[PDB]
Ligand binder design. Sequence first.
Ligand code: MG
Ligand code: MG
Ligand code: MG
Ligand code: MG
Ligand code: MG
Ligand code: MG
Ligand code: MG
Lengths: 242, 240, 196, 204, 117, 198, 235, 246, 222
Amino acid sequence: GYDLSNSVFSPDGRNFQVEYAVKAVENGTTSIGIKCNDGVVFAVEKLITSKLLVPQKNVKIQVVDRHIGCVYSGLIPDGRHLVNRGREEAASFKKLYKTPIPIPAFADRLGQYVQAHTLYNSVRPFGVSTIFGGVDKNGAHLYMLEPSGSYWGYKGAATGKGRQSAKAELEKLVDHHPEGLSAREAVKQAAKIIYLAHEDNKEKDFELEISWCSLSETNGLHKFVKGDLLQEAIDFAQKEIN
Amino acid sequence: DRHITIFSPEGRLYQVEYAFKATNQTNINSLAVRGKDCTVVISQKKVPDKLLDPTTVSYIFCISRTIGMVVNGPIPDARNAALRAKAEAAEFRYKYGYDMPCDVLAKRMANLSQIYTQRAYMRPLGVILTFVSVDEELGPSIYKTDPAGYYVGYKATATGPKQQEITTNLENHFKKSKIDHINEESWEKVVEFAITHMIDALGTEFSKNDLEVGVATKDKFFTLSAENIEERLVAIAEQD
Amino acid sequence: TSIMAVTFKDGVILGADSRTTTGAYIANRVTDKLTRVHDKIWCCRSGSAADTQAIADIVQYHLELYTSQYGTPSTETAASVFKELCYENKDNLTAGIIVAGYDDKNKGEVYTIPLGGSVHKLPYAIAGSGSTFIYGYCDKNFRENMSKEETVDFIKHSLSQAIKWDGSSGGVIRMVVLTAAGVERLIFYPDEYEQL
Amino acid sequence: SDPSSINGGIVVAMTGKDCVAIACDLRLGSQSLGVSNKFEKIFHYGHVFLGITGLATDVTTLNEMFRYKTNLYKLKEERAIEPETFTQLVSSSLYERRFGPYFVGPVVAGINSKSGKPFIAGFDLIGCIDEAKDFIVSGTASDQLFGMCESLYEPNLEPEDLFETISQALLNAADRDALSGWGAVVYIIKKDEVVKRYLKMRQD
Amino acid sequence: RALSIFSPDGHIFQVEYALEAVKRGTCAVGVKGKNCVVLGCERRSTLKLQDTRITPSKVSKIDSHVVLSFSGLNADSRILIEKARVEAQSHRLTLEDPVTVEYLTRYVAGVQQRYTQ
Amino acid sequence: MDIILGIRVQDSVILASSKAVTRGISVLKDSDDKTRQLSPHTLMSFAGEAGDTVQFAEYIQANIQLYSIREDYELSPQAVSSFVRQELAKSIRSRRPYQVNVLIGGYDKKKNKPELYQIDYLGTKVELPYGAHGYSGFYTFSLLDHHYRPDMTTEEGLDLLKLCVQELEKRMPMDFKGVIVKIVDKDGIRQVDDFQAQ
Amino acid sequence: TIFSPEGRLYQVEYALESISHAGTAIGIMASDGIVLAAERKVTSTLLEQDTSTEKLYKLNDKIAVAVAGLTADAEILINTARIHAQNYLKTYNEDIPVEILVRRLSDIKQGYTQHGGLRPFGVSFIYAGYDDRYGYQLYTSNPSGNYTGWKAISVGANTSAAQTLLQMDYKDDMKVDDAIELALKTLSKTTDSSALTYDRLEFATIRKGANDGEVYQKIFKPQEIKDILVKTGIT
Amino acid sequence: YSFSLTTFSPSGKLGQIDYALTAVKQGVTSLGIKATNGVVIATEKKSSSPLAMSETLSKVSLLTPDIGAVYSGMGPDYRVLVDKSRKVAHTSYKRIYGEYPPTKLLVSEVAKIMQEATQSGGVRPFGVSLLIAGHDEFNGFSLYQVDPSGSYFPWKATAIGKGSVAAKTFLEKRWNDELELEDAIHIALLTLKESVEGEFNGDTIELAIIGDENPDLLGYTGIPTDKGPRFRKLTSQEINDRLEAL
Amino acid sequence: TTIVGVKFNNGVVIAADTRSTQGPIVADKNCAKLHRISPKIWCAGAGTAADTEAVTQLIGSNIELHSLYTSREPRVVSALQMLKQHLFKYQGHIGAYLIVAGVDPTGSHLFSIHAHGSTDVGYYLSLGSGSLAAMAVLESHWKQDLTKEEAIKLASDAIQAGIWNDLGSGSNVDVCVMEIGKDAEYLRNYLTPNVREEKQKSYKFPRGTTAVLKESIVNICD
Ligand SMILES: [Mg+2]
Ligand SMILES: [Mg+2]
Ligand SMILES: [Mg+2]
Ligand SMILES: [Mg+2]
Ligand SMILES: [Mg+2]
Ligand SMILES: [Mg+2]
Ligand SMILES: [Mg+2]
């Protein structure tokens, strides 16, 4: 009976409801991020349930303020909620301190909020995990946040169903390029990694979505990868996919 | 009777008891000791995933200019305690005109924990907090609080799964030396002593990326970096 | 009250008289109007002693917390906090403050938060009743990227004038030097500034 | 317009050897119009007397309030309140309304049942306490009273003598006050007994 | 928390049970003649050594011309009675005419209903 | 202001009240009743600001009636007045005070004595043999003080009242259109419909 | 605060059970006074009975109540009882009539019965009081919020036992000295312990001495109980 | 959770209350003995490790300069209870009469705090029992025990927690109404010894008394009405000096 | 009113006159204006007396609690910060002007708070109607490093300045010395210079002089 109410500590000191929330996450689309030399790339797998979907429209990556990019996997709506709060939290930070919210600051903000939803049985944990980051006064930052509110910084991160395949791919990158990775490369790389991770869900045709926040390619602001730069990586992935 | 903090027929609070188990979920051990004029706290640092940015993994927090706190428990509950610790510390200063005494900060945090123990809607936090500083009135200090709402001051202490091993090790040292503190004038040595006795009890060797040290001297608490740890780690590989 | 903060090559200096009056009575002749809101962010206070002391105390607090959570605050941020307080509560405040701070990337910076609660960043700033008299002198003798020595004098001169003419100003001249090397407290007596 | 000068009235309290006295006039008026000549301003909760002068509705109210308060006090503590204690009660009770006060001027008088030390005290409309061992005055003829007291008063008077003194003080002071008079009441308080006397005086 | 709620059969148990409490209460009766109404009630006899002089009578005046007797939880009644008396004076004070028995009734009724939802 | 007078003889309390209601420049009504029966042995007369006047009296009435029902008892005049004092003493420090003055005459069935209470808009309450509010006192007190006697008959009081009313009609500037008189005694409250000539 | 399928309020019924486990309080209303006696629960040689007050409380100078149930629960109600008394006095300048105070206390209890979701008060009261309208009165209120008035009554443990004994020896024209005797008698025959001893009693009377006019409430001091005990013969 | 967590059970028992009383029973022993010119309360400092520092845990607390409290049960619950108690001594009393409340009243206030835990929605009772000792001009000396129910009663002597019955029995025999403070301390010490498992000395015992006024502890000289606090905690040394005279 | 705070080589002393006045009338020819906030922290106040007493007791109380809760001796900067935040809260309406002095673990302190909530620090300060007469003296005889005795004299004289030259002050001098190592010593009526001379006659009336109409015994007991 220790898994029926949220805040309940099982006899092993685990919060079961949090853990089930993770399952909701696992059942979701794959998404990743790659911290690069001076920015971060975000990419996600958009599952095309049917031809009736208007192409390149149901955008899933979101921005917070003007420099933080956010992507998550799990119950989509729960993510939106988390972002909205991020936005409110970011503004309040700017209003009072003028400087846009530093990513570590932002992260802790989201963290504290989520952690709170595992404190009372009158709330259910968030059925999502978010990967986000951006550029700030001192470097790039990539973070991943889980339903328990836990979050840490990453060099690369992934989540969703193709998660293990993806992480594997990310790990390769960290070991082959300790120097860093140019924003352009990471883009292509993310494209690949997603294509790859897509195999754990190898049954439906997909639409890739990528975004970046680079100090040299986007001035430190979050912009989506579209047009020429997007086709380039789609093909790069379509290439190394065989 | 076992889902909210009400009493059991035996007169126990199970949820409080299970919270104590969560404190161990991380599998990190730490310890703290008091110097002649400082206080140190070592804690293991374990970065599993290669994809993690090692620099952001810590369970040691700078609460105020003079107070440091180490947490044994899950990260979420840890940070949740930190933020409040920080705030409470600030508010204390603003309202009273002098920095919040570590022991006072601890009692405060303890009182907040007691509340989750008595109110059904609040789950306790599965974390144990060790507060350290060099009190302007009390000197080097270590005050630890737990999910039961208990808090007390220590000559030295340790926390983690291998708590008892470390404790006995230290218990022995103090029974031998007769004093309630390491007898060294510099923090560097106390840090050493600390890491030494850690190695001694856990039976393991530490590199620079496996430790996390925090020091508190008059008017300031800081965390050493890898490089600073090394100078300690090196200096130790000569006595042992 | 006469106060000014001047940014120089190595950082910034804040100077001010030391007289607080209640009418023509000198309630306190050794007042310290140079307030620390943070290690290297200080503010000069002009207006209601009560209003400013409070605002200061509050910014000092907001910044202590900022620190705990996100590290060292910029001067721009210290300013924004002051502005926020002054602007949002304008109806019940009589305070004009100068915020000056030192940072390694920005060197010295100076902000003036006038009565309306607005903020202006400037090379130097002067404020207080005695300031009226030295706008001419200051706009004339001020040059950018001066040495500490030069700056000290420029402040010592401007303020001795202000003290000369304004009766609401006097006492001793206090200064605070904010540079990478640290924080220095300076004090000049009447016996010196009076005859320059 | 000054609420403290609409109804008129004065009170005075003095201490002697093992006793205290407290007197008040009886007029209740509305400006120039005398309205009642039977408005005692002295009340007691056990062996503690409170005299109150000022706006009459407030005089009434407060009296009602302190009974209530002294009553519960007795139930909880199982003993009668003491002068010193009552005093702090009155004070705190008045400061409670620091920004919309009861326009009155209270005077406490009694003898501590344990120590036997005579006690009197007075307050202004917001609790500022005046504790003097000689005498306390309040009312529209305060100036008058001070004059009389400062002259007529001398320490350690016997009940029989204090009586005269306080009566005279009250009486002549009242005669120089428009809004006071129409009768007077004097209490002579001793550890064991308390005598109350009405004085004959000009009815103008 | 919703106590009075529906059941699969369309009943509000709490309301239904309320009725049972009524059944356990002593009897009360009222019959109306041609130019009068009489209300009689039986007195409770669980324990006897009562001071009839003071004991809360079973018939209560709502107003100089309206009465109310009941059967059930003696406590629960007092409330209905108070609210009724208060509304009797209130009607007078705003309509300048005392309540009609119907109105009074419709009032006390409305109260009970409210407590059911 | 209007006239409100009361005088308690030995077995009752007589209350007389002006019959005029003035609104600005014209006299609207010449037959107003400025009193309400609180309980069958307690009457309250009143004079003050336009609405406040009635609104207050009716409130008191309702509240005294409700107690009579809830308790099956009639509060003593003394009780009825303390209640009224308290209600006034409360409004003096409210948002908008009831600018009302009232006299309360009642026959205390328990004590078997008549009782007259004077209470002003401030909560100043006092018990007297005769009393009035506003300027009414200024002209009549001199007469009352002179001729009043505790053992007066109801008739003696009505004459004394008459005399008082006469003086008012003689020296008082405004036309109050006469008075309405009521007596409160052991048998209740009756209106002396013979005070235009008696 | 819900109903059972039988039309009963669980918590109230159960509350009453708790009460029956409480010491016995007895109130006997005479012609010229009222008596209240009560047997203390859990005592010892070391308990200070002298400076004790756990079952008999003064509500007002004219009203006192005997308690059977949770002492703490009692005190809460008592305080608000003492307060209503005083409020009424401020408002009207007359002592509150016993029934009004009683009715008020009861309505509070009833509250806990009908709404909120808070457990009722595990307490039952016997009110001995006097007033100018009905003279001496004795009342009782229990957790349901119901109250009623008696010539003699008891609460707590062994009620039926005691009530039966009371109904047996009680007669309309009684006198205090006799009621005292009877009160003690009954307690003595319904106790669950060895024998009635002063250290186990609480006793109080409300008399209107003929050589005066105001009612005097007297709470018996331990010695006086011991004395009143010898005279009535419990030895 | 706005409904009472302590409900009445069919037999007429307040579950959570009885359980809380159970929790109290498992706590360390603490006692209080009332003499003619004083009161003493003592307990044992159950060091949960020799690494902890015994002093940083006052099991005996001052509530007002003339009233002290010791407990048995869950310490945390006591800690917060002491806070609320000290506060209410001020808000409900010194801030109104300019003097500290008398023991029975403060006791009564604390009681009130616990009863509310016994009925307010969403809480569990306090798992502690306190012995509160104090003095006041009018009532003299007193000792009171307060339970989670909210029930409180006065004692000549008593003990609570673990060996309560044995202790109460030892006290029952030694106590008499002619005891001078030193003697009660003695008996307190004796009584304490029997329930104490390990080492019994000034660092494992905590005695405190309420006796004559200590001007030396006042902090200033001048005003002659207040001659000082009557509550005084015994020092390790002062304790030992009496132990050695066993 | 005249109150002064003078800091000395190892402590601080504060003093004040003892005259309370309602308008131009000496109400209390000897009231006390020296309040205790905590055993070793005292303050003197001028302005609306009821306010100085109230704000004093209130903070003293909150100070007594903070101590108990932190198991630490009270600190002046705390008393300061608390008074100033409360006074400031009430935008000047709590007419309390205070000089708060006292010793604590960090040393000796002397501050002044104006009713609007502004504070000052100095080695010597004064407040009240006698403020200027007293400050005149301090500005003439004060020197750095006064002994305990020099400070008492100084603070004492200053109050005398106000006593003689200010209509708003008078009667006697109260002193309170807070030395670091020792207990605070409150010297009530350290100085008594204004004693009324023996009246020229006795106004003791001969018994029976007053006219009584009715006599009766009042009942105190229940
Ligand atoms: Mg994982
Ligand atoms: Mg909880
Ligand atoms: Mg809960
Ligand atoms: Mg000048
Ligand atoms: Mg005056
Ligand atoms: Mg006169
Ligand atoms: Mg003078």
